Amino acid sequence: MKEFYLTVEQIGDSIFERYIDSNGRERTREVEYKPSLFAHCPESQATKYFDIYGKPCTRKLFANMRDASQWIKRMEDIGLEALGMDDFKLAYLSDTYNYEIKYDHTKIRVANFDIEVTSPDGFPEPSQAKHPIDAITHYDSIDDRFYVFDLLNSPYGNVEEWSIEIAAKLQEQGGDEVPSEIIDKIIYMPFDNEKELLMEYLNFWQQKTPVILTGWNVESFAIPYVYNRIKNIFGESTAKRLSPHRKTRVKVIENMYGSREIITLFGISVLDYIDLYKKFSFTNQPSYSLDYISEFELNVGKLKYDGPISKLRESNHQRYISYNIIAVYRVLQIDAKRQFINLSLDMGYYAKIQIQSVFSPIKTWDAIIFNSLKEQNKVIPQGRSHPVQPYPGAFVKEPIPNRYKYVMSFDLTSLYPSIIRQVNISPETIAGTFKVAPLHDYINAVAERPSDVYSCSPNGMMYYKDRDGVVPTEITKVFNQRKEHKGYMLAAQRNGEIIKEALHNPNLSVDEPLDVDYRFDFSDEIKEKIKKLSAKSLNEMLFRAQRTEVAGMTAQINRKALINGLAGALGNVWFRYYDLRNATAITTFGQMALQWIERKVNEYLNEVCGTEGEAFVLYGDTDSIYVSADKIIDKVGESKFRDTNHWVDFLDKFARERMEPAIDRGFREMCEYMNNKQHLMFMDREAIAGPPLGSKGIGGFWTGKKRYALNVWDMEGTRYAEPKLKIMGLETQKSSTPKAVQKALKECIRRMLQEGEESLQEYFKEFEKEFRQLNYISIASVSSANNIAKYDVGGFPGPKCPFHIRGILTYNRAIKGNIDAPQVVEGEKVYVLPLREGNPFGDKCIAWPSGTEITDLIKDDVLHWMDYTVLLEKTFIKPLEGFTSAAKLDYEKKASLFDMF
DNA sequence: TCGGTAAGCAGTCCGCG
DNA sequence: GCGGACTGCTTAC
Numbered sequence: 001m002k003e004f005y006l007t008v009e010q011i012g013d014s015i016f017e018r019y020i021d022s023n024g025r026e027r028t029r030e031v032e033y034k035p036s037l038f039a040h041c042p043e044s045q046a047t048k049y050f051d052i053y054g055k056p057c058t059r060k061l062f063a064n065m066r067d068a069s070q071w072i073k074r075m076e077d078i079g080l081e082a083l084g085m086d087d088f089k090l091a092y093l094s095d096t097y098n099y100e101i102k103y104d105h106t107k108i109r110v111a112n113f114d115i116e117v118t119s120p121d122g123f124p125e126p127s128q129a130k131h132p133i134d135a136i137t138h139y140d141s142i143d144d145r146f147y148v149f150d151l152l153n154s155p156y157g158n159v160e161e162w163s164i165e166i167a168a169k170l171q172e173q174g175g176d177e178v179p180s181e182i183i184d185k186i187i188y189m190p191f192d193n194e195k196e197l198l199m200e201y202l203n204f205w206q207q208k209t210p211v212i213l214t215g216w217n218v219e220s221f222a223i224p225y226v227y228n229r230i231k232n233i234f235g236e237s238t239a240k241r242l243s244p245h246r247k248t249r250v251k252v253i254e255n256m257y258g259s260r261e262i263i264t265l266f267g268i269s270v271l272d273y274i275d276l277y278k279k280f281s282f283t284n285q286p287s288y289s290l291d292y293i294s295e296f297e298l299n300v301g302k303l304k305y306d307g308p309i310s311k312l313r314e315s316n317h318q319r320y321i322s323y324n325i326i327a328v329y330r331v332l333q334i335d336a337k338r339q340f341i342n343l344s345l346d347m348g349y350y351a352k353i354q355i356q357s358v359f360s361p362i363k364t365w366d367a368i369i370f371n372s373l374k375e376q377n378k379v380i381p382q383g384r385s386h387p388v389q390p391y392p393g394a395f396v397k398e399p400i401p402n403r404y405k406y407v408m409s410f411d412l413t414s415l416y417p418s419i420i421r422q423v424n425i426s427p428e429t430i431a432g433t434f435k436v437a438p439l440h441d442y443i444n445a446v447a448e449r450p451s452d453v454y455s456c457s458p459n460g461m462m463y464y465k466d467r468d469g470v471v472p473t474e475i476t477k478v479f480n481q482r483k484e485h486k487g488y489m490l491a492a493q494r495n496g497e498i499i500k501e502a503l504h505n506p507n508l509s510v511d512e513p514l515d516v517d518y519r520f521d522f523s524d525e526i527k528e529k530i531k532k533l534s535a536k537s538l539n540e541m542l543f544r545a546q547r548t549e550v551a552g553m554t555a556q557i558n559r560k561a562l563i564n565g566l567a568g569a570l571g572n573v574w575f576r577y578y579d580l581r582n583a584t585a586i587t588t589f590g591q592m593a594l595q596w597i598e599r600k601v602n603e604y605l606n607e608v609c610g611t612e613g614e615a616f617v618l619y620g621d622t623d624s625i626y627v628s629a630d631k632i633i634d635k636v637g638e639s640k641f642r643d644t645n646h647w648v649d650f651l652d653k654f655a656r657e658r659m660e661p662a663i664d665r666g667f668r669e670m671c672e673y674m675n676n677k678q679h680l681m682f683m684d685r686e687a688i689a690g691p692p693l694g695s696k697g698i699g700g701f702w703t704g705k706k707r708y709a710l711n712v713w714d715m716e717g718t719r720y721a722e723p724k725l726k727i728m729g730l731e732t733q734k735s736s737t738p739k740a741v742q743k744a745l746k747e748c749i750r751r752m753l754q755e756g757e758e759s760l761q762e763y764f765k766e767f768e769k770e771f772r773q774l775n776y777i778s779i780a781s782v783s784s785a786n787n788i789a790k791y792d793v794g795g796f797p798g799p800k801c802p803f804h805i806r807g808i809l810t811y812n813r814a815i816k817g818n819i820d821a822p823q824v825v826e827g828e829k830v831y832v833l834p835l836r837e838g839n840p841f842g843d844k845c846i847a848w849p850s851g852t853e854i855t856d857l858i859k860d861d862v863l864h865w866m867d868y869t870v871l872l873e874k875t876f877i878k879p880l881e882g883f884t885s886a887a888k889l890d891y892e893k894k895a896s897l898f899d900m901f
Numbered sequence: 902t903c904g905g906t907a908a909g910c911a912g913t914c915c916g917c918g
Numbered sequence: 919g920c921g922g923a924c925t926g927c928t929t930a931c
């Protein structure tokens with residue numbers, strides 16, 4: 001097989017590399033890598049190395065990496081550019097793996113672990129590590145085993161061995177319900193003292209050294225705790241055995257309002273799953289406790305136990321250990337679904353970076369571009385200092401707040417990356433500038449044509465047309481991968497709808513789910529078999545289709561994020577290729593493109609309808625337009641349609657056969673106007689929306705920019721079995737909105753769009769009457785909690801104290817003195833409830849850590865004093881008032897002349 | 902929260918005769 | 919009470 005790296009580090013003058021050799025074996029080597037850097041040289045000197053602007057460079061070979069670093073400093077002291085890859089491990093990887101990396105995940109040791117630490121006096125601080133580690137569960141992907149290290153004797157209690165037999169039993173049998181599929185995979189090791197546990201853990205780690213190390217909160221808790229505990233018990237040298245190279249560094253992670261410490265383990269790639277989830281999931285969650293996320297992702301029940309976690313080991317060690325094991329497994333289950341580890345490996349090996357570098361778009365693109373240029377013997381420029389400067393972004397049209405009955409939307413494929421490719425925007429393709437007219441003049445095609453030679457953006461920038469820049473070249477490669485995965489995602493989605501349709505008529509039979517590839521549209525044969533399947537088999541197929549769709553989503557959306565990140569990186573001062581001329585060339589071109597096509601679409605539809613000056617485009621944001629289709633439907637007449645699906649077909653055909661070619665012609669003209677390299681503005685129909693045929697539903701409404709709701713029948717070619725609400729920006733979509741209120745507001749919107757005013761009024765009346773029975777957690781608002789200290793003045797709110805922070809201060813006073821009460825963590829999320837006048841907490845609200853029950857100390861008082869009226873008005877009535885006034889609807893029935901009989 | 906801009910709403914403070 | 923200046927937070931792209 002082809003060799004591939006696992007990890008790479010620079011330690012002084014050596015590269016330390018762990019890798020898989022040509023025989024599939026894991027090896028380690030220390031290499032005294034001699035790096036090269038570059039300086040500009042005279043034109044009259046034979047060289048094969050040229051910078052990105054075509055100027056010749058001489059290669060300088062250094063005796064070691066320190067000499068190279070020292071040369072860079074001296075070049076700065078002289079005032080001359082020091083060119084080349086200054087991150088020597090990336091240059092090392094580039095030299096050692098000069099080919100597309102083919103990796104084999106089965107050879108990569110991925111470890112998932114979780115520790116338990118009993119603590120009577122509050123949260124066990126990893127920096128102090130003053131309490132025994134009393135359980136470790138460590139799953140190894142090569143062995144496919146859960147290694148359980150269980151401490152039986154501690155200063156906080158001596159316990160009996162954990163029983164695998166009780167663990168496996170149902171909770172209704174007094175068991176822990178450890179999933180039967182992992183029972184045979186558990187290797188249980190009890191210990192009579194912590195020193196032996198830890199020594200054996202280190203020996204095990206030496207034998208089975210993680211390459212990828214993951215788990216939940218491992219980077220901020222488990223790793224620093226284990227490292228510091230071993231340090232405290234045995235000394236530094238022993239703790240450093242967590243690194244295969246015996247090198248570690250305390251790394252200070254700084255933010256706007258403070259800092260925290262993590263431990264860097266040289267020769268390991270830590271991918272904390274909480275951080276993977278935050279980066280790759282495209283959710284914003286009210287809580288990031290593993291219980292919360294596992295319930296969200298997997299629909300598994302919360303892990304239940306009585307009493308505080310600090311007493312769980314002593315009271316129920318059996319459950320304590322089972323729950324530690326289940327926690328490790330839940331992360332594996334989330335990864336089986338989301339495939340974030342697979343994604344990280346794909347991206348990391350593609351860029352030729354340390355896998356953990358996938359968190360940084362700047363590092364990722366720096367490596368991709370370097371490798372690409374090096375192929376051509378080109379030499380990358382030195383990174384420079386730039387002051388942070390704001391620059392302009394997208395255009396968003398101000399909509400007229402209203403109901404909109406029939407709507408068709410259109411959206412440009414991969415806009416910013418397509419602009420980069422079309423215009424040919426790259427550091428080395430800058431050709432010069434032209435005299436800019438106001439943007440409106442380009443939008444309306446009255447400005448002078450910018451150039452007859454170069455490719456232009458309306459910000460005044462011109463670009464070479466003779467050859468693709470490295471940025472367009474490399475962005476195109478990742479765009480093509482994204483396109484492939486999006487194809488699979490959409491096929492799985494369409495296949496899911498086929499199964500949902502079939503589920504309306506399940507067969508009374510015993511059978512099996514079909515063995516199919518859900519990434520490809522079902523054949524006629526498969527469709528016929530599906531129509532004969534039982535509900536059991538269909539539901540299993542639906543689950544599998546949806547899992548295929550999720551895998552496709554992960555693969556596609558994060559490649560989209562990577563390419564969009566390149567467009568953004570051009571506007572970040574830490575990027576080697578930072579250039580506001582290029583960043584603004586992209587965004588300004590986007591503004592023009594949107595407004596240009598709005599004009600073209602309006603002109604086309606005014607022509608087909610025989611009107612003038614009518615606004616068909618009701619809204620647009622960045623690269624999408626929303627077109628009112630009422631007049632189109634009305635030209636046929638609603639009475640002429642057999643059913644909803646009939647007019648959906650008609651609009652689908654109209655969009656594809658009439659509007660899209662008109663849109664294409666419009667953009668080809670704009671491409672010629674800007675003299676661009678290649679026409680890549682591809683704007684396709686996204687949504688078809690409207691009320692159910694014959695209903696009183698309103699179909700859709702806008703309240704303002706970035707705030708709208710649509711009843712969608714077809715999205716990007718997926719024809720839904722049931723209409724789907726597309727809701728953007730409204731409170732139903734915000735993590736700050738109480739769970740039960742999101743649900744209620746969604747049902748209000750559903751009724752407005754699908755059923756009409758009377759239906760909405762019926763539901764509102766009932767919600768208002770019954771909502772006081774809702775569980776307090778479900779009606780609590782949520783907020784991130786920053787700068788608690790700034791606003792704390794002797795335990796009371798200082799000037800301008802935010803409402804959620806006031807709530808936290810209230811909570812702090814109420815739990816004061818109590819060492820065991822859950823502390824609100826700076827920067828994390830809190831639930832927030834308002835309090836009625838005259839409550840014993842002495843303020844108007846209280847907040848506590850999100851994803852948790854409020855402590856039993858104050859719960860009953862919070863429940864007694866909760867201000868339901870304020871809750872309802874703020875979270876429900878106010879947003880609903882916004883929706884209905886925009887939609888010209890009443891959520892409460894107005895008096896009429898009939899109220900007299 | 903270590904890892905592009907536009908723009909909405911909640912809330913504070915305070916003016917507004 | 920509501921709007922502007924401002925902070926804080928959270929979306930849509």
Ligand SMILES: Nc1nc2c(ncn2[C@H]2C[C@H](O)[C@@H](COP(=O)(O)OP(=O)(O)OP(=O)(O)O)O2)c(=O)[nH]1
Nearest residue numbers: 411412413414415416417564565568622623905931
């Ligand atoms: N830097 C950055 N830019 C973004 C992000 N999301 C959207 N944008 C910018 C770049 C996009 O090309 C543009 C339009 O966004 P869309 O959501 O329509 O995505 P895009 O057109 O890239 O892909 P698509 O093919 O429509 O899925 O807005 C983001 O997360 N980061």
Ligand SMILES: [Ca+2]
Nearest residue numbers: 115116324327
């Ligand atoms: Ca735990």
Ligand SMILES: [Ca+2]
Nearest residue numbers: 411412413414
């Ligand atoms: Ca788009």
Ligand SMILES: [Ca+2]
Nearest residue numbers: 411413684716
């Ligand atoms: Ca599309």
Ligand SMILES: [Ca+2]
Nearest residue numbers: 505507531532
């Ligand atoms: Ca059937």
Ligand SMILES: [Ca+2]
Nearest residue numbers: 411412623624
């Ligand atoms: Ca869009």
Ligand SMILES: [Ca+2]
Nearest residue numbers: 911912920921
């Ligand atoms: Ca206001």
